Amino acid sequence: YELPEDPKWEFPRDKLTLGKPLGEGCFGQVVMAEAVGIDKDKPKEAVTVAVKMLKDDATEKDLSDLVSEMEMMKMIGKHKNIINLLGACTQDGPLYVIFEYASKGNLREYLRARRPPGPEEQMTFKDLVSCTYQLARGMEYLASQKCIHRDLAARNVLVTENNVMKIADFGLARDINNIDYYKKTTNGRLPVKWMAPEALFDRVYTHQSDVWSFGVLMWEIFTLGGSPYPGIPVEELFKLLKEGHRMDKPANCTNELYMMMRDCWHAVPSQRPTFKQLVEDLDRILTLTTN
Numbered sequence: 001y002e003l004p005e006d007p008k009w010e011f012p013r014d015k016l017t018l019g020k021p022l023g024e025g026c027f028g029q030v031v032m033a034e035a036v037g038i039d040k041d042k043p044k045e046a047v048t049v050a051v052k053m054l055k056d057d058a059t060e061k062d063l064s065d066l067v068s069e070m071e072m073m074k075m076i077g078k079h080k081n082i083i084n085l086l087g088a089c090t091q092d093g094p095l096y097v098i099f100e101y102a103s104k105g106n107l108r109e110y111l112r113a114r115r116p117p118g119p120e121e122q123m124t125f126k127d128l129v130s131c132t133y134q135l136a137r138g139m140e141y142l143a144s145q146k147c148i149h150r151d152l153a154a155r156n157v158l159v160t161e162n163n164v165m166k167i168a169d170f171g172l173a174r175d176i177n178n179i180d181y182y183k184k185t186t187n188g189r190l191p192v193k194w195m196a197p198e199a200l201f202d203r204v205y206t207h208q209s210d211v212w213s214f215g216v217l218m219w220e221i222f223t224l225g226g227s228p229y230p231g232i233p234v235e236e237l238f239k240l241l242k243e244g245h246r247m248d249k250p251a252n253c254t255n256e257l258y259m260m261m262r263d264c265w266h267a268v269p270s271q272r273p274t275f276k277q278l279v280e281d282l283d284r285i286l287t288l289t290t291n
């Protein structure tokens with residue numbers, strides 16, 4: 001029927017001017033927009049924002065996933081490495097969910113564009129470790145709010161004008177307690193190649209599962225946007241993972257950083273590092289690459 005009123009987050013429709021699509025596709029559409037007075041301390045300034053909305057062919061599930069995501073953003077609160085929810089238009093028209101605009105797009109594309117020949121300038125090692133640290137800080141914050149993301153991956157990280165990493169796409173994110181444990185139907189919409197064995201084999205999802213996906217994200221980063229498990233089709237992956245198969249070291253990556261990835265991929269979930277442990281180790285490594 002209708003969405004309950006949340007005045008704390010409501011933004012007036014007549015102050016929002018939708019602009020050009022940024023993408024379109026499967027779940028929903030994202031559109032640039034000018035929002036006048038969305039920073040309340042400056043009520044007459046128009047700020048460039050990004051608006052998520054439904055497409056024409058949207059389904060009931062599509063709508064409830066958009067609602068879901070907006071709800072989750074409100075609950076987790078604010079962090080420098082998480083995309084900022086600015087407001088929503090929930091009343092008397094299409095659901096618009098308003099986010100800060102990250103100028104440089106998703107990390108996967110940003111990284112591929114900066115591959116050495118054969119905005120364009122080759123990434124340095126220090127840059128790749130920084131990016132990694134930022135994302136580990138975001139995830140550390142997330143875990144501490146009892147939220148699992150479930151869909152960590154380069155395509156789901158946005159990059160601002162100042163090259164700040166923001167974890168985005170909270171469509172599938174859940175409170176740790178709000179998982180339907182052991183049920184056949186659970187975790188059926190997570191990209192197989194980023195997903196921990198136990199999310200499929202056992203139908204559970206813990207922070208230790210997000211750590212697995214972080215490992216895959218790290219490999220993505222150090223390959224400058226490579227596709228996980230090159231040339232292994234999704235249909236064969238799990239039998240391989242069960243057998244102990246793991247991706248090889250990227251070239252632009254130190255033995256130490258690769259050992260961290262392999263740690264994130266420990267078969268036993270409790271044997272993987274915590275996000276807190278990852279943050280500490282990445283700090284040490286970054287502080288030392290800088291000096």
Ligand SMILES: */C=C/C(=O)Nc1ccc(/C=C/c2nc(Nc3cc(C)[nH]n3)cc(N3CCN(C)CC3)n2)cc1
Binds near residue numbers: 028
């Ligand atoms: C299922 C396929 C599909 O729909 N893929 C898809 C979804 C969404 C997008 C949008 C990408 C995007 N987003 C931003 N910025 C942004 C989004 C949000 C919530 N906040 N900021 C920016 C960009 N670009 C800016 C840089 N350009 C060179 C490329 C696009 N893209 C795309 C595909």
